[PDB]
Amino acid sequence: RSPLEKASVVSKLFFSWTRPILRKGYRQRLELSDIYQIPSVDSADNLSEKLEREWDRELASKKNPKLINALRRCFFWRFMFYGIFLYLGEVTKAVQPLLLGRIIASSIAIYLGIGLCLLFIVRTLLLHPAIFGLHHIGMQMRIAMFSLIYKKTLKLSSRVLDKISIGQLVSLLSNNLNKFDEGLALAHFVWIAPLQVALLMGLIWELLQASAFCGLGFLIVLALFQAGLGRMMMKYRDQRAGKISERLVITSEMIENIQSVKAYCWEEAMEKMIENLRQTELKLTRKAAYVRYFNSSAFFFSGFFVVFLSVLPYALIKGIILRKIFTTISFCIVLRMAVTRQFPWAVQTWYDSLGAINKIQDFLQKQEYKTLEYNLTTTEVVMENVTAFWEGTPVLKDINFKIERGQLLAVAGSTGAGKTSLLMVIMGELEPSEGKIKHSGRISFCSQFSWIMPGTIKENIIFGVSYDEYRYRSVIKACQLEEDISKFAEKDNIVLGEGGITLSGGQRARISLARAVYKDADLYLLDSPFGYLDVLTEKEIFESCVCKLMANKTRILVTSKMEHLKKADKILILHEGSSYFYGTFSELQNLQPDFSSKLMTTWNTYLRYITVHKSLIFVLIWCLVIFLAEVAASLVVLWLLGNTSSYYVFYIYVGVADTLLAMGFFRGLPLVHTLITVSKILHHKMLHSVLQAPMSTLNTLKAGGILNRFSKDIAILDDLLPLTIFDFIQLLLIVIGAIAVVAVLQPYIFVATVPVIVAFIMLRAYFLQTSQQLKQLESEGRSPIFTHLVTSLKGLWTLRAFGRQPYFETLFHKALNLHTANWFLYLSTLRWFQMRIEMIFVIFFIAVTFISILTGEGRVGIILTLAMNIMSTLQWAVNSSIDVDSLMRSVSRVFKFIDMPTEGGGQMTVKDLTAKYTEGGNAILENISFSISPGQRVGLLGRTGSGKSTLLSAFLRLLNTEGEIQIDGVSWDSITLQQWRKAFGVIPQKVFIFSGTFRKNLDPYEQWSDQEIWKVADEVGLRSVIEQFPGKLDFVLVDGGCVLSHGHKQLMCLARSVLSKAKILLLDEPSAHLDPVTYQIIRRTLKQAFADCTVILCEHRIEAMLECQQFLVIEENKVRQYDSIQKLLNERSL
Amino acid sequence: QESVKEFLAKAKEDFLKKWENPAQNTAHLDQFERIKTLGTGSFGRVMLVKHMETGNHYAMKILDKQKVVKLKQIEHTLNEKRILQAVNFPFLVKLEFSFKDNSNLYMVMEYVPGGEMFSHLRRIGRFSEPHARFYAAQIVLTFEYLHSLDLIYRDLKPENLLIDQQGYIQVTDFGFAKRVKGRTWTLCGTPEYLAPEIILSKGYNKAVDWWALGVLIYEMAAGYPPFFADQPIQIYEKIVSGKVRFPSHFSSDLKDLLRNLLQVDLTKRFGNLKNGVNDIKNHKWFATTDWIAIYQRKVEAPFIPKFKGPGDTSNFDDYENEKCGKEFSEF
């Protein structure tokens, strides 16, 4: 069924499984369905079976939940099998330079060259398969890592479910979403690297026997300094994070109030504040980048001293042949590359794995929900002595409820005041602490909060059932669901998506009632099912099914409606969590009549990135000239020397390509500084552009994309991009310099090197398309798993009620396998790319070696040693090119976002009014006309409730609108929009408040006097409103000014508008937002101070607007005018 | 030391002479007003009155003698009366006169225009850190002065602390206070201020006052009690555990000293080891807290009450045969 199953041994070694996959991908666009079938051994159901069996065996075995000790029994044999070849290949690569310790004598070396060439093939064979094997082991383990906790998700106790952090599990899942899988490559490196040192030290003592630990101590000191720099780097990052979070909060606040900001014309102040805040974060980031650059450069710089100090003692003591010098150079290169890189990375990987193991082992051990032992056989259920806490506080006051088998029970009282908890306990969601509950157990419940998963009508109705024609028809016809179904487009198979927005809340309640009705059980724990429908609809549903069909069976509906409460078989009213009265319907109705009555990646993109800041070009020119001059000087030195012992020692300066071509400390810092400066310039440009964008395109994009436009993208640009770009540049320069040095050795090298580079470029280009397609597909597919997890989290209670968890497990496994298919495909393609690149490099090295062998001792040694080192640099270079390709996506997104178009007396006259949200959308006005009275308010009446916010926005032209607005003789065209809109006074339903002290929050422009501000605030009733604030006026508006009430915020907005001295002021929804006293104070203040303005108070209720003198009646597509109520009340309202 | 210890010695000396000659029945309820009830308080009734003969506004703490007998708190009332009649410290509002009627007893206290700081903290939520230290310094001063007399307050609630026209807090509610040297087995009061030693039902010494003041400072900065639970039994268990999470805004210097103040070890409690209050005085949280200069209370206050005359109740809330006369023989 799977193509990789139909693979030969040689095909498996070549990993050519994706060869037709690559053939299709480089030809045509990616198709998700075209993915090869998942491996049989890769089945989530299969692997999780063994994982769970081992976990259970261990959990029973001993008093220590050592999950690692169990998973060792699952994986250690394969881990050691891969590690054996891994360590063998490491040993081979380490020992290979010693074989070069023979050719230096120059006949016989031809066989040595053939063997050295074969060593590359052998090492590549040993290396390449191991990465794929260990990574397959990792992904296999990770699948069950998800699976065990996912199964436990249906096992947790609800009492801790309300306490367990919802985000903690999400963060736990996301943390190892990619880290733990890739974290296996360094696994056996512990078992190898110490052995690598053991071999290398023996090699050195073989060459020296007297200078061994001299360079080892320098290497250890370098490792110590490198580790020490990390603590300072982490401290700098931690310091930067808080200010970055504050800046993000301010930016999010601006994003939420974008329309109000455009109205207030505060873009400049917002930009100035954002830049001023970002200045300190930029300083911290520059310091952190300097530290990181020093740390990264230390590794490249170490190579010179690493050989120099090791050689200096032996060389001074006695003479040494340069052959051993080159050999020691290679040996030390290997020793350093392992000591400085392998050990710490492996230590970090193991520590992270151990911590994750501890966390996972702790998580699964939590106390689980105990299922009720029921469904055997029973008559009418009864309860006795119900008393327990929902978390002390007895949710039930010794309650008892003997429900007849077939009866229709009901209870009333305060909503969710423990009656819902009593229902949950009866359903088994809450363990009763007192008394004894007995029930048949087969019973459905209907939570007040509907949990609708995606799926068609049949899916929502079945939830693991067959298609019953009569039952489905009865459910539709009885739950008011037949008409709503007919209202659906397909009307039978409308596959619902995510969010449930396709249906109304009463539609969701009807869905819940139908879902409860779908299965027959001992009881139906209804909880206010009619809570979202009209009274007539509720009565119809009751008479049809709720009080007709299932009422013949035992039923318990949480209903407070008096009319149904009269017909109930028994009632149970509880107050303060305690049943005040209950019992038979007639008996309870007669025992207390008084209570009864009372209660009832383009090259153009890279060029634009380069062209952002001119300093980058100068820095690049300086670095390039420095590199070229250094290479030329090295070539001149080599030529002069090749055609007293200090001259021999100077050959070591050429011996290490890393130190010879190292980016000078006097050069690298300017590159990163320019990177940071260009990032800051880009941030400022993006902020300025976002301030001017037209609203029409702004509404088209979702607002959360505006947050994502800077939440991570700017961070990636600041941190990730500079380091990667600099490392790639330095590595490329070093490699190119090595190539030039080798070409200087003999006049044949370039003729072969050029085809190798060209083929490498072609191969990289071919691999890039498939790699990007696979990465995008895999990233896109990951979301559905979190979507299913969130759906399960939302529906947990209803799922526990249904008991059909197997289908949810099937869905989760299907999604996990779907993601795993793409992940394995991408990993395999990357492995094939790595193997092919290694093969190309090996071929080039072999050809160069043969050419040199056919061909002076120092030149041969230099060429061979440079060849002996270039491989790791080339691999890092390929990885860096891939990383740059990955990083360029954020820059492309930023460039696309910046590439946006900009937005572009009291008497007044409007005409030819055309408006819409988008270009050519719903016509908000049909050539509408209106006249503004001098100093008199116009009542926004007529079609109130059909939407007046659009007309209010059109008063400032904040929408896709065009027409005529001739106010005071001034037109809508001559004046700039920033100057034309200022005359209007905004009174939004939601007040926009900048988080900060009152002085800044009320005066963003900062062009007034403090005494005048205090005098106006006293005139605007804010002095007493501010006297209760911290200090006098410096009170920072934390949480968006959470201290201020809605009426206080309205007063603040009115005061700010009065300070702006606007000629107009359109009011909106005064009584809707204001409390009684707040509305009174607002009316008094407006009628006192703002008496001299041509206002427009928009009110849905005509009575609220009845005080207005003028009246502008609204109607669908025609905003009429009614000067006087003598005709307005008789024609517009009547 | 020097002058401060010389003053403490004089205060301790004069307190004994004051305690040995307590007054009784200083006045009758015939020269007061009934303008408004300032509140109830505990199990009594508080009302704002004006001196008919002089004019000075004065509070009157009414309480039923039947309530004292039935609540089994009569000796505590007598001890409170004597201690209030003998107290001498600037940090607290003094008691002026005593009334003893056949129906109830009243106690004359000065008019407190600033009201309770608990309501102000509810209005503002969280005080600034220097604002917290400003009150905490005088609190420590008054507590150590009580240590200079060897008495146990046995009462610490947010509403009991008033504020002066000068901005200094005003102390009241001397009911649970008693001058007992050593350990006492009595247990009562607010669970939020219940030390584990009192919760353990053992002999209690003055050491619990440091924990009470630490809880006061922590809650004043946080706005929420460090120990809180739905039921008092769970609250008692949480207090017995002696563990609570510091707020994100909590400073290291203040929180580290709060760790010593809230240390479950009563012997290791800050202010009880060796030096009395000297270790607290040298603490960096009091790095700028002039203990001696506060004796004049000349420091600029964090906030001043909006006083508009003694007769205004704006700071206050706007609300609305003797039983065993042989026991009340010295009132």
Author numbering:
A (entry chain A): 3 to 108, 118 to 402, 437 to 645, 844 to 886, 910 to 1121, 1125 to 1173, 1207 to 1436
B (entry chain K): 13 to 332, 341 to 351
Relevant lines from the article:
Three distinct CFTR/PKA-C complexes were observed including two 1:1 complexes with a PKA-C molecule bound at different locations (termed site I and site II, respectively) and a 1:2 complex with both sites occupied. Despite rigorous data processing, the final resolutions were somewhat limited: 3.8 Å for the PKAI-bound complex, 9.7 Å for the PKAII-bound complex, and 6.0 Å for the 1:2 complex. PKAII docks between the two NBDs, interacting mainly with the helical subdomain of NBD2, and is also within van der Waals contact with an unassigned density protruding from NBD1. This density is connected to residues W401 and P439 in NBD1, and as such likely represents the R insertion (RI) in which the phosphorylation site S422 resides. The main reason that PKAII is less resolved than PKAI is due to the conformational dynamics of their respective binding sites. In contrast, PKAII binds between the two NBDs, which are inherently flexible, leading to the lower-resolution structures of the PKAII-containing complexes. As the two NBDs approach to form the closed dimer, the structure becomes incompatible with PKAII binding. Our structural and mutational analyses highlight the functional significance of the interface between PKA-C and CFTR at site I. At site II, due to the limited cryo-EM resolution, specific side chains engaged at the interface cannot be unambiguously identified. Nonetheless, it is evident from the overall position of PKAII that it also interacts with CFTR through a similar surface as observed for PKAI.
An example of a protein activated by PKA is the cystic fibrosis transmembrane conductance regulator (CFTR), an epithelial anion channel crucial for salt–water balance of the lung, intestine, pancreas, and sweat duct. CFTR gating (opening and closure of the pore) is under tight control by its regulatory (R) domain, a mostly unstructured segment containing 10 consensus PKA-C phosphorylation sites. Phosphorylation by PKA releases the R domain from its inhibitory position, permitting ATP-induced dimerization of its nucleotide-binding domains (NBDs) to open the channel. The PKA-C consists of a small N-terminal lobe (N-lobe) and a larger C-terminal lobe (C-lobe) joined by a flexible linker.
